[PDB]
Design a protein around this ligand. Sequence first.
Ligand SMILES: O=c1[nH]c2ccc(Cl)cc2c(N[C@@H]2CN3CCC2CC3)c1-c1nc2ccccc2[nH]1
Length: 269
Amino acid sequence: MAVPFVEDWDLVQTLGEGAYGEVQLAVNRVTEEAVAVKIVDMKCPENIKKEICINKMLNHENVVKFYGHRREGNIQYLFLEYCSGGELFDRIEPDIGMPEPDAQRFFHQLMAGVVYLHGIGITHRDIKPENLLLDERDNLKISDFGLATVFRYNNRERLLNKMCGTLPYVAPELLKRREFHAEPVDVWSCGIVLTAMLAGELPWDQPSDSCQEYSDWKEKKTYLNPWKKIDSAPLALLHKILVENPSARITIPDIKKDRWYNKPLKKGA
Ligand SMILES: O=c1[nH]c2ccc(Cl)cc2c(N[C@@H]2CN3CCC2CC3)c1-c1nc2ccccc2[nH]1
């Protein structure tokens, strides 16, 4: 009775969506802490044990947090950090976006976690608003790593070649290169999220020259949408992130030294 009941987590509101389905909400029975519980099947692995193995690495307040998992046979109960704020996705007004300051804030915290993960040599590989969560105090938390993978290990980097993520966010070299560096791809996806945060619409369908939109951008025709909606400062920033050559793109270390990234905008409380 060192307990009693405490590890009884009641199933409730269905948070839904990926990976594939479903992540539930879990009030605890005794203390009713709230937790994110992702529900997975035997029908994966071993892709699961990978997600769970990575998820046991993450320790940052901008990265969703791991607690454990119950085996329950061919159903895995994933115990993950809960955020009440919901998807950053749902904070972007369509065709509008949001207040530059709110956007810059959210972006720092995104850079925060993405620097961190890259820190420990991991890449998320599907950064998008549906995947960037917000707690009660609107703090961005990167979630879902069933897709994230190890790219550095023992100091040595690995070039990725697997195509994955989400077309509108995925960077160009994912579509034109056999192998690529993991980090430049996460920056682009982050840049794209900045566009959507400052524009409330996505720039293009895929980073294919085959896309009228993508070509105009590489034309510099930034009187078109969305860049038209975007102010000059951050638009100077997206001009460095959304750089087709992954070797010429901006690096997060330099993104930290960008005029707009370091322009004062938002107040707290
Ligand atoms: O708090 C969460 N923690 C997670 C930890 C890991 C994973 Cl894979 C998902 C979530 C996760 N859901 C993904 C975020 N999105 C929906 C389900 C799931 C995939 C895409 C939430 C969440 N909290 C919410 C609060 C309100 C509304 C939804 C919410 N989802």
